Design a protein around this ligand. Structure first.
Ligand code: MG
Lengths: 460, 357
């Protein structure tokens, strides 16, 4: 007997399908399961068991096809264009790196990581990637594959940081950069005698900011550094002593007004509130984007040191991240109001066509894009969780925003394993013991550090 | 008349907890730049925090025997000076904080030192001792009786203290640039509870148990007497425009005073089963204010002052905040708003301070 059917058109972003076989007659009662084995058929793509998900006009298919048809205004002889994607391999918990204090920052040195690629173009690495962890105790720590400390930064008494560190990233395998509450930015040189022993030695002490330096972006090719600080200023720095100007001696620990001490190439007070983020533009290093608690995203022309554009959102901004789409520039802005706002820097103000990422229950203070999917990214929040997003997933906004723009919901939630371990089914209030301060997404995995004194690793 | 939905933004959720104090947290205060929080409590320690993360970046134990009753920042951004009252002393300190550059430290120290050598007394100005000096506490001002309230003047050269059992000396005005302490109001008659300066005019408010006296600071003369009609006033706050008051009382009445029209309350608000401990206006342009009660809750209100369109203040309760644990029949003891954002911090008897947004 001829079971009722639905006509579908398969399309995709991921390499694909011959146009001969992309339109298809399919049982109306079929589901994600059946549709993906059809895709895994001899006929279609001969992939044995790749799990697929299906997007219809921006929504994932959780039920049968007919249910989608009836849910909307389509008539069961409507032609459905299903775009299929790779099902997210769930990033489950794997390990934790224990610290004696809060983990403020996290970064990964891998073959695919930005610093690793810059390194190849000083050494390069095969199966021995490094994890950098900054802590509120003022010390940087370098970890390896089996979660043991290879290197540890010297204390403040020996040229290290003299206060809590707030941000730190790999410049290359050769060089690090870090910043904190001592108003300094410190450039380090990392040497590794053998693969369980390493050493960190200060290259520069960088002075300039009038407050805590809370955000850090780096470029390993040109040896340059971007900083956002509580003083409301964005700092542009060189990590080489040669091109770095002389400091404002009044900002020096000596004044009452060993390591070389230098200043910035540019320090611009462009915000009326704490500057929370500053990143290099992926397409153009000459351009930088900043985000602050003054509700603004500002674009910076680094060569002229001028604000060529200003975007003003509704809420304070605590984190910023750049995405490739280079069809356009696309930024993700974490807000204190618990949501993310997707923006195009030159809009001047958010149009009605603005995307929002909802799901977090607290301040979103960290962001990192997917290494393999351009459309995906992960966020770190003070709610204690990390949420993975797929920007292809989008629905209209409800009375939540009074039907303004579109809303995306997480495709995965990384819970804090420290909390989940207790077996309790009651969550910490206000991220009491589990706040996430920094998350980084590498192909080696998803690494997140925070208040629970742990760097949490998640991978498939 | 409007609904809470139309009256956004206002704080709805608990987002940061400040832990470290032992015993009740008696006071909370956010620094002028909205970056740091200050707390004081039973353990006699003053603690300064990173606001959004809730990290303790600095602390000091002023007095072993006396709890810190109140902490209030100097309202100037050109300095980083914090005031703390414990027992009969006022301490003026410079917290160790990332915003404190060598330049800002010096500017702060200069402000504290300027009064020196200006040609049972009301106030005793002196160094607090090497121990406290090493931690950035540079001045101790000793008054006659236990201090329950500190209120700065906006320019930061004057601050008042209130000692409910100081009798004739219950209310003192201190002048920082002269190291001077005066008792300017001598027949106040009634028990002084707290006091405040005026946001735009040379006026001074003194709250007793039942009324609030308004003084001309230039003439040291009484101008008017505000009558809340409460049996015991616990606290009050002045709107930035200087023409409105909210008054809290142990009677559990929250009162809005329209000073332009009368000395009696415009509206009376009862949203608590226990005494109201503190009230605070948002000072940065947002039409919000809040009260703190021993029932463990904070009630957030929408409060709009009169204008062209408005003949009366628009008062609408938007949200009650719960989360503080009541301990020994004490709940929330103090409130403060962020300078610009709709964020408030609360002092808890449960040994915590909590950030709401
Ligand atoms: Mg008037």
């Amino acid at each position: 007997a001829p079971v009722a059917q639905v006509k579908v058109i398969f399309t995709t972003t991921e390499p694909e399908l011959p146009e001969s076989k992309r339109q298809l007659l399919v049982p109306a009662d079929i589901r994600r399961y059946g549709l993906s084995r059809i895709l895994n058929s001899e006929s279609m793509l001969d992939t044995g068991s790749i799990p697929f998900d299906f997007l219809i006009n921006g929504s994932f298919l959780r039920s049968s096809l007919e249910d989608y048809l009836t849910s909307n205004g389509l008539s069961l002889e409507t032609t459905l264009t299903l775009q299929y994607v790779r099902s997210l391999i769930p990033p489950v918990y794997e390990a934790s790196f224990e610290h004696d204090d809060w983990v403020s920052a996290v970064d990964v040195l891998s073959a695919t990581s930005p610093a690793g690629r810059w390194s190849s173009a000083a050494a390069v690495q095969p199966g021995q990637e490094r994890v950098l962890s900054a802590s509120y105790d003022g010390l940087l720590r370098i970890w390896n594959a089996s979660g043991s400390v290879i290197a540890t930064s010297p204390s403040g008494s020996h040229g290290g940081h003299t206060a809590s560190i707030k941000a730190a990233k790999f410049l290359t395998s050769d060089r690090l950069a870090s910043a904190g509450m001592d108003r300094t930015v410190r450039v380090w040189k990392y040497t590794e005698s053998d693969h369980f022993t390493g050493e960190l030695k200060p290259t520069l002490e960088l002075y300039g900011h009038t407050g805590s330096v809370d955000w850090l972006d780096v470029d390993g090719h040109s040896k340059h550094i971007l900083t956002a600080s509580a003083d409301g200023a964005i700092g542009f720095w060189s990590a080489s002593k040669a091109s770095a100007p002389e400091p404002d001696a009044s900002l020096l620990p000596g004044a009452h007004v060993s390591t070389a001490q230098r200043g910035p190439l540019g320090l611009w007070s462009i915000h009326t509130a704490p500057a929370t983020a500053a990143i290099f533009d992926p397409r153009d290093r000459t351009v930088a984007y900043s985000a602050s608690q003054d509700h603004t995203v500002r674009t910076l022309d680094l060569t002229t040191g001028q604000v060529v554009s200003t975007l003003t959102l509704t809420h304070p901004l605590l984190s910023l991240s750049a995405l490739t789409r280079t069809t356009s520039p696309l930024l993700a802005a974490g807000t204190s109001a618990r949501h993310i706002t997707m923006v195009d820097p030159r809009a001047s103000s958010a149009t009605t066509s603005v995307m929002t990422l909802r799901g977090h229950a607290n301040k979103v203070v960290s962001l990192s894009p997917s290494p393999e999917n351009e459309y995906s990214l992960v966020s770190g929040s003070h709610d204690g969780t990390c949420r993975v997003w797929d920007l292809r997933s989008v629905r209209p906004a409800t009375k939540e925003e009074g039907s303004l723009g579109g809303v995306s919901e997480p495709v995965y939630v990384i819970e804090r394993e420290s909390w989940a371990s207790k077996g309790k089914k009651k969550r910490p209030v206000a991220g009491d013991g589990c706040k996430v301060f920094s998350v980084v997404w590498d192909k080696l995995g998803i690494f997140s550090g925070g208040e629970d004194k742990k760097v949490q690793v998640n991978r498939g | 008349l409007p609904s809470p939905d139309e009256l956004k933004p206002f704080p709805t959720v608990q987002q940061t907890i400040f832990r470290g104090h032992e015993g009740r947290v008696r006071s909370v205060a956010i620094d002028p730049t909205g970056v740091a929080l200050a707390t004081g409590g039973d353990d006699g320690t003053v603690r300064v925090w990173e606001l959004l993360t809730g990290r303790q970046v600095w602390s000091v134990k002023l007095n072993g025997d006396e709890a810190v009753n109140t902490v209030r920042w100097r309202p100037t951004k050109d300095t980083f000076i914090l005031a703390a009252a414990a027992g009969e002393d006022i301490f003026l300190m410079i917290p160790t904080h990332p915003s404190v550059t060598p330049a800002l430290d010096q500017a702060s120290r200069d402000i504290l030192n300027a009064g020196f050598g200006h040609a049972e007394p009301p106030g005793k100005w002196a160094r607090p001792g090497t121990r406290l000096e090493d931690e950035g506490v540079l001045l101790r001002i000793t008054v006659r009786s236990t201090i329950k309230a500190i209120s700065w003047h906006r320019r930061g050269d004057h601050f008042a203290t209130v000692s409910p059992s100081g009798q004739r000396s219950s209310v003192a005005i201190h002048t920082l640039s002269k190291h001077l302490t005066q008792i300017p109001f001598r027949k106040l008659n009634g028990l002084a509870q707290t006091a405040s300066f005026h946001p735009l005019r040379p006026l001074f408010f003194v709250a007793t148990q039942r009324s609030i006296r308004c003084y001309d600071l230039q003439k040291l003369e009484l101008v008017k007497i505000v009558q809340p009609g409460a049996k015991w006033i616990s606290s009050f706050d002045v709107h930035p425009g200087g023409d409105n008051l909210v008054v809290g009382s142990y009677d559990k009445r929250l009162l809005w005073h329209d000073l332009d029209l009368s000395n009696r309350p415009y509206k009376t608000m009862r949203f608590h089963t226990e005494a109201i401990r503190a009230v605070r206006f948002h000072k940065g342009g947002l039409p919000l204010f809040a009260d703190a009660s021993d029932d463990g809750s904070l009630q957030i209100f929408h409060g709009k002052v009169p204008n062209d369109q408005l003949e009366n203040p628009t008062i609408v309760p938007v949200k009650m905040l719960k989360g503080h644990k009541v301990v020994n029949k004490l709940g929330v003891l103090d409130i403060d708003w962020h300078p610009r954002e709709p964020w408030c911090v609360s002092a808890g008897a449960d040994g915590t301070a909590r950030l709401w947004m």
